[PDB]
From a paper:
In addition, Lys234 is located near the proton shuttle residue, Ser130, and may act to lower the pKa of the serine hydroxyl to facilitate proton transfer to the nitrogen leaving group of the β-lactam during the acylation reaction.
The structure of the E166A/K234R apoenzyme was determined to 1.8 Å resolution and contained eight molecules in the asymmetric unit. A clear difference in the structures is that the hydroxyl group of Ser130 is shifted in position relative to that in WT and is directed toward the guanidinium group of Arg234 in all eight chains. This rotamer has an χ1 value of −60° compared with −150° found in WT CTX-M-14 and nearly all class A β-lactamases. The presence of arginine in the K234R enzyme, however, shifts the equilibrium toward the ∼−60° rotamer, as suggested by the E166A/K234R apoenzyme structure, where all eight molecules in the asymmetric unit are in this rotamer form. The Ki for the WT enzyme was 80 nm, whereas for K234R it increased to 390 nm, as expected based on previous studies.
Author numbering: 27 to 57, 59 to 238, 240 to 252, 254 to 289
């Protein structure tokens, strides 16, 4: 297709490896580029962890309001919200928002602990039919992003299908689905990624990821004005362990997709 050829050209100009999956909910069409190759998820895995806790809240009705102590020993490498609440508490809802809207790694680790470890996050993926997602480590070691390492990986196709089922489908209860959408629409970290390549009037909820090997990710649910919603996953990784972030590549892929 023309879109796949422009994405292929983008990838060549970038010096890295690009993976894209688009789902059009208008006619259920899919556009894929390296859609079945594995990429390190990095912080895009936070969506599965928050959704698994939302799923627990369907039976534990008050769960999102439960306070969780934040201790100095809990802090890891990137804790923009958790550091504000040391020697205090945050609710599970506040921790979910911190992970999803600020990429907070201490918050992610609290969600994983609430699910019984990384295997509890992968478990929720399996329960909703995602056979590809695997979470193996906590943050930040899940961001090592080493080529050929299957740990903490998924494919663009699997992630797009899962994001659709969580935000637009019915993998979650209706209040939980709305909560997850609200959280994603308020993300603060994606202004230079998928959002920077789409029309300014569209509404977007997104979750970014970043890691070693210059890994730069974004997964988004997109509401175009006057069109059925879209789900778009853009994953990007580079040959050098120390490569810099390339959010511009995700914006360019989103622009390529949107024009097609």
């Amino acid at each position: 297709s023309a879109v796949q050829q422009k994405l292929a050209a983008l990838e060549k100009s970038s010096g890295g490896r690009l993976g894209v999956a688009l789902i059009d909910t208008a006619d259920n069409t899919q556009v894929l580029y390296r859609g079945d190759e594995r990429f390190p998820m990095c912080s895009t895995s936070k969506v599965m962890a928050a959704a698994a806790v939302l799923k627990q809240s369907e039976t534990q009705k008050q769960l999102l309001n439960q306070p969780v102590e934040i201790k100095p020993a809990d802090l890891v490498n990137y804790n923009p919200i958790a550091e504000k609440h040391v020697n205090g508490t945050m609710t599970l809802a506040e921790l979910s928002a911190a992970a999803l809207q600020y990429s907070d790694n201490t918050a992610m680790n609290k969600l994983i602990a609430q699910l019984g470890g990384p295997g509890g996050v992968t478990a929720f993926a399996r329960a909703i039919g995602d056979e590809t997602f695997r979470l193996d480590r906590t943050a930040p070691t899940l961001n090592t992003a080493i080529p050929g390492d299957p740990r903490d990986t998924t494919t663009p196709r699997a992630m797009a299908q899962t994001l659709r089922q969580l935000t637009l489908g019915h993998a979650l209860g209706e209040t939980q689905r709305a909560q997850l959408v609200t959280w994603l629409k308020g993300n603060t970290t994606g202004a230079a990624s998928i959002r920077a390549g789409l029309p300014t009037s569209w509404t977007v909820g997104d979750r970014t990821g970043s890691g070693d090997y210059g890994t730069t990710n974004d997964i988004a649910v997109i509401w175009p004005q006057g069109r059925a919603p879209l789900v778009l996953v853009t994953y990007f990784t580079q040959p050098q362990q120390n490569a810099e972030s390339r959010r511009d590549v995700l914006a360019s892929a989103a622009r390529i997709i949107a024009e097609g």
